[PDB]
Amino acid sequence: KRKRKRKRKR
Amino acid sequence: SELPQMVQQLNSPDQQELQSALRKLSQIASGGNEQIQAVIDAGALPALVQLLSSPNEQILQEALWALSNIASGGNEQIQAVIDAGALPALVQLLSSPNEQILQEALWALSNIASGGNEQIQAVIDAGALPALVQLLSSPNEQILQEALWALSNIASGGNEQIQAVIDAGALPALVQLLSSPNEQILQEALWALSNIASGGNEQIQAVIDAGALPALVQLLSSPNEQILQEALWALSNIASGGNEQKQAVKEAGALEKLEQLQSHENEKIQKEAQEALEKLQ
Ligand SMILES: [Ca+2]
Ligand SMILES: [Ca+2]
Ligand SMILES: [Ca+2]
Numbered sequence: 001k002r003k004r005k006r007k008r009k010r
Numbered sequence: 011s012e013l014p015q016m017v018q019q020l021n022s023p024d025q026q027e028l029q030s031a032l033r034k035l036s037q038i039a040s041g042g043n044e045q046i047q048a049v050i051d052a053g054a055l056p057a058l059v060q061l062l063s064s065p066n067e068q069i070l071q072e073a074l075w076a077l078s079n080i081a082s083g084g085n086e087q088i089q090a091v092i093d094a095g096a097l098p099a100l101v102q103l104l105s106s107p108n109e110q111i112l113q114e115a116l117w118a119l120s121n122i123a124s125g126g127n128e129q130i131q132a133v134i135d136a137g138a139l140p141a142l143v144q145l146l147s148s149p150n151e152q153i154l155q156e157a158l159w160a161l162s163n164i165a166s167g168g169n170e171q172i173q174a175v176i177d178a179g180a181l182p183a184l185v186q187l188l189s190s191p192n193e194q195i196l197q198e199a200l201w202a203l204s205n206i207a208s209g210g211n212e213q214i215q216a217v218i219d220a221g222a223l224p225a226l227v228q229l230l231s232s233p234n235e236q237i238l239q240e241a242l243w244a245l246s247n248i249a250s251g252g253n254e255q256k257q258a259v260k261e262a263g264a265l266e267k268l269e270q271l272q273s274h275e276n277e278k279i280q281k282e283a284q285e286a287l288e289k290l291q
């Protein structure tokens with residue numbers, strides 16, 4: 001049930 | 011009020027105008043769910059999906075960053091990406107021999123799979139799992155990490171979503187990764203297992219039948235609290251199963267280690283060890 005997101009940032 | 015113009019520039023035949031617009035859009039989408047909604051509302055999705063067919067790697071990379079950032083939004087914002095038709099073109103990029111493109115396609119897919127069960131099932135239905143499972147054999151640690159994120163996300167769903175991961179043959183590779191000397195990769199493999207084992211008893215028993223318990227029980231002796239925690243979360247999830255599952259945990263020698271961990275100085279460790287030990291009576 002553990003979710004994770006990754007952003008793409010400069 | 012500049013957004014509509016940026017979205018029109020995504021069609022410009024001047025690659026400088028196009029790229030300027032694309033870089034601005036991707037970064038506005040990184041700024042929270044309201045900014046994501048502004049990008050969606052300005053009509054960016056169809057243009058961004060079209061750009062997943064570009065043979066221009068500079069355009070494709072930034073397009074992928076924009077889609078990844080939109081997919082860091084709420085579940086219905088993720089669903090907008092799926093509804094704009096992104097997934098086949100995105101999944102197809104898992105065949106790329108270009109590591110930058112592969113890495114960026116995996117992030118995007120992993121974010122989509124961080125949505126709710128409708129969003130996860132769409133990723134499954136698009137055919138991603140065999141590729142993701144094969145990337146568990148990658149000798150590229152960056153790619154391997156990302157495949158483990160995507161798979162962990164997929165396995166964060168309900169039992170049907172979990173079972174699709176199991177049916178794609180992920181478990182033998184995940185269990186092999188438990189012997190990695192790479193502490194980063196080990197923890198990601200434990201996360202994937204600890205999501206799979208949060209399913210029902212049939213999913214838990216698949217984790218057991220693939221031979222996870224001896225390795226998890228060994229990891230209860232790790233001096234690295236990050237690893238230990240992740241192994242404890244996995245084993246505790248397994249112990250939440252039925253009596254057959256509990257018995258397998260006991261037969262593997264977990265009780266004696268858990269009793270030792272009850273007094274651990276790390277409070278998160280101590281609490282999960284106590285909870286695990288109680289599940290097993
Ligand atoms: Ca041109
Ligand atoms: Ca290459
Ligand atoms: Ca190491």
